[PDB]
Copies of this chain bind each other. A is one copy, B any other.
């Protein structure tokens, strides 16, 4: 078939992606986000993920950062085909207001609004922004309720709910989303409890960076669990990755050295410096190893596609320029290699 991996990108909302570099020529403005998003649509990217944080965890708590939900709404209004996946943390949100905001954006975008339900917690951010803390055990319980409420409000003419964290009586919501089965819910999480929520309540699974072998195991495990459960198959498997594409491997590696200088180490040492890689680039972006020539990156993308990855959630820096490079040099090679016999 003509039906392979989708290319998604993280919407640049923090003024850059790199903890170790100061200026990446990525202004933290809506204009830059919009420009990047409108170009991505021309270049073959199908989806953007908009992270939700009240504080800039790449450049520092006092560094400027765009707000997720209002950025999503504004971006929906100025795009026409991009899927706009927006992160939501239950502890910073009221589920009934959120279900309404969500339907509204889905309506004004004609069906392009989706959610990434995040149950991670940054304590410092919670204390600054009035997050409701839940004990680590009970955190995924809250997510469960929150998500049950969203789905109910999107489906039912009248919805009531009684649980441990929320209570609603005869709530009406109109209009409903454009998406006929509710707004698509992506979700991630590594814990046993976290994975139960994905399995039982999410429409799709997203993960942070891993090797092709690690990702294969997680996708296969997850597919198996999901068969033992009364929902339809998971609709996507998303992998976070940071891409360094250069004409030669050696130039790629020199960029890798640059972005991991804390603000000549060899290939093998770069590949083994896990702690520093993780610090230097969020979501374990470097671990998928999309670092090299277009040829190498294309082969590697294809290996991820074979073990079940259906969507890449890519970061680049400087973002707009590096996305253009990726569309021109990597994408045609992925197509060609998939058609090879």
| Bound Cα distance from A83 to B322, whole angstroms | 17
**A70 contacts partner chain B, Cβ-Cβ < 8 Å:** no
Given contacts A46-B180, A46-B328, A179-B44, contact A78 B111 (CB under 8 A): no
| Bound Cα distance from A333 to B80, whole angstroms | 8
Q: Which 9 A-B pairs have the closest CB atoms?
A: A110-B335, A110-B332, A2-B321, A78-B231, A44-B179, A3-B321, A42-B235, A110-B336, A2-B325
Given contacts A42-B203, A335-B111, contact A80 B232 (CB under 8 A): yes
**A19 contacts partner chain B, Cβ-Cβ < 8 Å:** no
**A163 contacts partner chain B, Cβ-Cβ < 8 Å:** no
| Bound Cα distance from A325 to B6, whole angstroms | 11
Chain A binding surface, main DSSP class: loop
The chain B residue with its CB closest to the CB of A232 is: B80
**Could you list 19 further interchain pairs (A-B, Cβ under 8 angstroms) beyond the known A78-B231, A112-B332?**
A2-B178, A2-B321, A2-B325, A3-B321, A38-B232, A41-B181, A41-B232, A42-B203, A44-B180, A46-B328, A78-B232, A79-B231, A79-B232, A80-B230, A80-B333, A80-B336, A81-B332, A110-B332, A111-B331
In the complex, the answer to whether A111 meets B332 with C-beta atoms within 8 Å is yes
| Smallest CB separation, A155 vs chain B (Å) | 11
| Bound Cα distance from A3 to B232, whole angstroms | 27
Chain A positions near chain B (C-beta within 8 angstroms): 2-3, 38-39, 41-42, 44, 46, 77-81, 83, 107, 109-112, 175-176, 178-181, 184, 203, 230-233, 235, 318, 320-322, 324-325, 328-329, 331-333, 335-336, 339
In the complex, the answer to whether A175 meets B2 with C-beta atoms within 8 Å is yes
- Chain B residues within 8 Å of A78, by CB: 231-232
| Bound Cα distance from A322 to B325, whole angstroms | 25
The chain B residue with its CB closest to the CB of A6 is: B324
The chain B residue with its CB closest to the CB of A34 is: B231
- Chain B residues within 8 Å of A81, by CB: 180-181, 328-329, 332
| Bound Cα distance from A77 to B232, whole angstroms | 10
In the complex, the answer to whether A38 meets B233 with C-beta atoms within 8 Å is yes
9 contacts between A and B (CB under 8 A): A2-B178, A2-B324, A3-B321, A38-B233, A41-B181, A42-B235, A81-B329, A110-B332, A178-B335
The chain B residue with its CB closest to the CB of A7 is: B179
The chain B residue with its CB closest to the CB of A323 is: B2
- Chain B residues within 8 Å of A231, by CB: 77-80
- Chain B residues within 8 Å of A329, by CB: 81
| Bound Cα distance from A191 to B83, whole angstroms | 36
In the complex, the answer to whether B2 meets A42 with C-beta atoms within 8 Å is no
| Smallest CB separation, A86 vs chain B (Å) | 17
| Smallest CB separation, A294 vs chain B (Å) | 8
| Bound Cα distance from A6 to B128, whole angstroms | 45
| Bound Cα distance from A80 to B330, whole angstroms | 10
- Chain B residues within 8 Å of A178, by CB: 2, 335
| Smallest CB separation, A184 vs chain B (Å) | 7
| Bound Cα distance from A42 to B230, whole angstroms | 15
- Chain B residues within 8 Å of A42, by CB: 181, 184, 203, 235
| Bound Cα distance from A77 to B188, whole angstroms | 28
| Bound Cα distance from A175 to B3, whole angstroms | 11
